[PDB]
Amino acid sequence: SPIETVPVKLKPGMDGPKVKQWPLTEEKIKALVEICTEMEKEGKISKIGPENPYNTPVFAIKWRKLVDFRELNKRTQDFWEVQLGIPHPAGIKKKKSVTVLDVGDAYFSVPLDEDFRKYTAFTIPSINNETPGIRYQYNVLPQGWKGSPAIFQSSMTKILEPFRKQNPDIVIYQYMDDLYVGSDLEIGQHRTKIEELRQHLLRWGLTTPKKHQKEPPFLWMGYELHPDKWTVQPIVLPEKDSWTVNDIQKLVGKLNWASQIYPGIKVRQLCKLLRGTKALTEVIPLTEEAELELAENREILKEPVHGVYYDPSKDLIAEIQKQGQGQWTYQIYQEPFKNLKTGKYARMRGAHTNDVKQLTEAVQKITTESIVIWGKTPKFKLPIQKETWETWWTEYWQATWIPEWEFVNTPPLVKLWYQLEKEPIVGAETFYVDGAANRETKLGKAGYVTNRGRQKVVTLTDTTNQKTELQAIYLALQDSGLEVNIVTDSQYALGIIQAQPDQSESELVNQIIEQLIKKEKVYLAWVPAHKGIG
Amino acid sequence: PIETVPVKLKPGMDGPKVKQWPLTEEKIKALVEICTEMEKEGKISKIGPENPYNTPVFAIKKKDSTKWRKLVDFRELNKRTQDFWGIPHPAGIKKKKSVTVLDVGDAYFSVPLDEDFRKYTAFTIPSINNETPGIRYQYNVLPQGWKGSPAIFQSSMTKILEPFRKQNPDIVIYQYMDDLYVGSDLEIGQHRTKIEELRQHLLRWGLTELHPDKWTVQPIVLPEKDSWTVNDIQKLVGKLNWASQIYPGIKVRQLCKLLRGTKALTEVIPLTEEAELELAENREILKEPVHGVYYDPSKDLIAEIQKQGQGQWTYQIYQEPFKNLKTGKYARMRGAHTNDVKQLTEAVQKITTESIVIWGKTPKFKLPIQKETWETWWTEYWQATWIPEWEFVNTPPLVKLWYQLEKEPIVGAETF
Ligand SMILES: CC(C)=CCOc1cc(NC(=S)c2ccoc2C)ccc1Cl
């Protein structure tokens, strides 16, 4: 072609590949000898001679051909990332017409930096490793070579510039060997322009085909794309009578992907089947509950989920629900009930945190996503009162934020499970708690003594020092009335005061939190340990 | 329109390969414009895929403009770029009544960049939803935000300034990145007017309110109370005890003897004469910054920030723990009430400029924010040509409680 080549080079100080030509039968050689005389005439390759010390093994599977560039590739320089981030159905706009042009064969239509070609040398074996084999090399981007994807696209980009300029109201998406061309022109004008494009391309040697011709809807990321809207490619759950772990994991994976689009999907009981499995091929019988939810899911999945595309002229709204502790669901739409996208985030589990914090996190993940999809952030409708937000955030130790949002009374609402008092409680009993353990024998004591004369101690075995300290706080909570002042020298209690977590990785802390939540007033105070403090 | 100087990366260093972070539509539209223009003006050229480097780029709205400015994050490239051993720090700059900052980044485009170094300036304009490939460019001229620009352009900058410097030798001019910090004691009126005089001058080539003498270092003020309760003393003792890591003469022995017994948290305690004096000696120690603290040009400058709440923030600049070079409080700027990120951002910029004015270098920040929160939004409120380094931390409860104690004005900074 008359396309300028891209200057390619080998990684820092490496030399081209020298892997020996795998041995083949006469049937396989006569076939490759065939295919290569073809490519050779199509200008795709060039018979070279002894002036080449490089080589790549050529194979023959059906009689087609396959060149293994694993070696050349590992020696080839790196190119700037070839579009790895693809479009999401929720972000594209509806089109009157969309046509996909298979410019696949164009892979072998783009010239290869003449200087680099020598490295693509390969050998068609001899009938019996007797006489010298047939030597060749590529003049174009080799199928399976590292720089082909990047170079093919950049080349496609240059070529498409003029056309793109001349036809602003026409969108062309380049992906792999395809060109999805969309537009809002009358179908005849569209068809006309596709032909103009097809020709323009033809001008650069890029020939595109009615038979292979692809038509809408299109399969993309698990959606079926129609010009006016999208649908989810129906997902089928293999009804079986013998489930191995592989079957069960794969299943859970697909169900996991479905929870994004379909409401009510559940895998809790199916995941239970994975416990203590001794091998992938191990057959695990489905419990009753597993047989059950796997049944409801088959149903939920029979429901047709359809969607809509992005209309720039309308608002972008994002609604969030708290389907359980740490679990969040959301749907983004412009017009009520016509979603662009939906999804949910894996149960957020951490060392220690709170629901309002988690919320802001779900909010930032959506925002990061939205900026990518629409280059704008959705207006949020959150299940939390503006007061709850103002109270929490304005005082939290960590910087946090939520873009423009509005409250929506869709229970369950996210709230503050408790709030430590800001000042000691007059008239409330004051527990002076303390815990201590031998870090090596794991033996400890936990207890308290109050200004009111109440006291208690407990001996613990196989415990840690932090646990005794917390258990001391726990007992105080357990044994006090609705209002209590608790003083401790526990450094961990210092974190609890600052962060006021409503969820933790520590079961003990969680037990403490359940107590905190239950009290009407709790003042937690910290003092340094080993002082004149009694 | 001159010859170019051979620049290289530090030995063993390869070019940046930083991913472009996602941009809003507005931001992308502005860059496309700004970039086709510079392309036409020959300042940048589209590049191939054979160039593997990349640097994040984005757009800001500098003070007073609806026009977007292209801002590139050359932090990575800067660190990789060789050294030029710029100008030493004019210690005097930090002692001026008034200091004004000027953006002279536009002077660099008038200078060609070594062709051999261009590959490394590769940047990419993303596309919404990835429907269009990214628009790859690289620079042909000195870029704003790259440490090499103010360096190479030093000789030309000094020349163009001498006249003003001599006409006004009582004025100090220090350049940092794309910035120029002009400091003088002239009254605000004769100052700002003297600035434009400099502008006009600086202007005839192609170029277009700080008070260092008021960045006083503040003392910790321990509470004084008519009557003290068990809790008051405890809160107190805990802070003082922490504080003893800075001032070893601070003691809570006598006070902790009052915390003997299991009395109610709200019960009043009589302060023994020993306790009384103990507090007095402590208040005296805290009457001044700890001795022996000197800045070290060979050390990294650190800037820690704590969120105090209600739009309040505290920071400390040090190189070694508990040996602050400076500390202070920061109140949110009007129109930022509901935005933690905007407030923090504004603070980072304020502290960095101070750090620049004082030591002529930026501090590495310890920020009380989650990485994602910051990365998602800091750019929306950024206005400086430079970008400091940062790390995300968890604020220790005590550090916040201690600096919460700093002294504030009797009334404030009064002016009708
Ligand atoms: C992601 C993908 C393969 C899209 C092509 O299919 C469609 C694309 C659009 N609308 C847009 S904005 C368009 C047209 C060509 O390329 C794009 C990205 C609408 C419907 C379908 Cl069926």
Swiss-Prot record, chain B:
Listed result of changing residue 64 to S: Confers multi-NRTI resistance
Effect of residue 96 to E: Confers resistance to atevirdine
Effect of residue 65 to N: Confers multi-NRTI resistance
Native species: Human immunodeficiency virus type 1 group M subtype B (isolate HXB2)
Binding site for Mg(2+) 1: 103, 178-179
Protein name: p51 RT
Gene name, Swiss-Prot/TrEMBL: gag-pol
Positions of disulphide bridges: none
Variant or mutagenesis effect after changing residue 66 to N: Confers resistance to lamivudine and stavudine
Effect seen on changing residue 150 to S: Confers resistance to lamivudine
